[PDB]
Symmetry: D3
Subunit: 72 residues, 6 copies
Amino acid sequence: METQKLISMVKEALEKYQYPLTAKNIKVVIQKEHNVVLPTGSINSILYSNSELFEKIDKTNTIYPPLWIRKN
Amino acid sequence: METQKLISMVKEALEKYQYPLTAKNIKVVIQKEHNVVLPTGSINSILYSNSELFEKIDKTNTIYPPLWIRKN
Amino acid sequence: METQKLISMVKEALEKYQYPLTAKNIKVVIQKEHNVVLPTGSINSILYSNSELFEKIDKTNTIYPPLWIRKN
Amino acid sequence: METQKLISMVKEALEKYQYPLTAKNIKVVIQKEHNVVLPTGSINSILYSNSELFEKIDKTNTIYPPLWIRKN
Amino acid sequence: METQKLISMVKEALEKYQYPLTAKNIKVVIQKEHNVVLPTGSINSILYSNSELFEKIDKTNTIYPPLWIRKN
Amino acid sequence: METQKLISMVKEALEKYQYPLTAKNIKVVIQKEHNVVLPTGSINSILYSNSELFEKIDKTNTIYPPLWIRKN
């Protein structure tokens, strides 16, 4: 259930801004809006592990740290 | 190596992509097509010191590290 | 350079050590014995996209950045 | 007005220590004194954008992450 | 006395997990358990400065960021 | 490559500058004049393991990442 709360926060960051975001961008967006300091890795875990909810905008293995969008 | 070749490598990097990039993204892009590893802070010097060619896309002091665009 | 040579470099790196490694550890290991500097995020792509060869050792969402093992 | 508050905190960190500081040094100095966790990027933004208040002690494009002093 | 409190927290993180941890792993373990955001450097200081309490599991100067165990 | 050549590269790096440097600063300095990219953690090993040549300038456990000086 913690993971589901974070997934909703990640979607929420991504939907608030209409361009791709790095995992660290998403972390700080969640920090400013929900005032919790989360490890950047925990945002990455969500991003990589829910491949039907999030995807990298760069599919050529060049943009690092990767930029992420919602898969929709 | 030359101020005026780094301006144009950063500028090329932004122009290759349709979305904002971080300074570190640009670093990795340049390391890819010109095979030179620059410090992340060398790109920031260029980006801030040339406010006519580059601007940040978020102006609410929220997105960090900042996402940069080639200014239209 | 090749997806299937990076899988085996990451996989070699884990196998050289008796304990879990981070993605960045693996990066530095590969930079050591194959003299190529990869972005940290390129290793993560491999680790998550090959969940049959690699798994995280902590499953409590606590260890970040995650520690990875060659799956037994 | 948020930016003005941060500018005052940055000056305050720099004036408390009588040697140059990195943006991350300044971040943690502000954390310990004012107990707010700010993105390192937001300190950088202040530093780079107020070129008449702050300047890099290294003008040879070598020290990275840059070391900063107050321009005075 | 602050340093002694941190030393006890570092030992406590290391003893809670039965594999080596990076300084940033230890930081976030202490964050989750004691809810304080400490600079990663302050964990490193403890680790490097108390060489009879902590040691790197890798003695070949390869694993970076280093992985740490309790010396026992 | 040699313990005793890294001691003298770190030591040269500090001596080139009139102010304290971080371990990462030293890394970038060495990458500049000897064209070898070392992991940040390799410099820390040298700095802490040679407490006769190097010391931190802040002794209040505030400046992180620590700023280092050639000991007078």
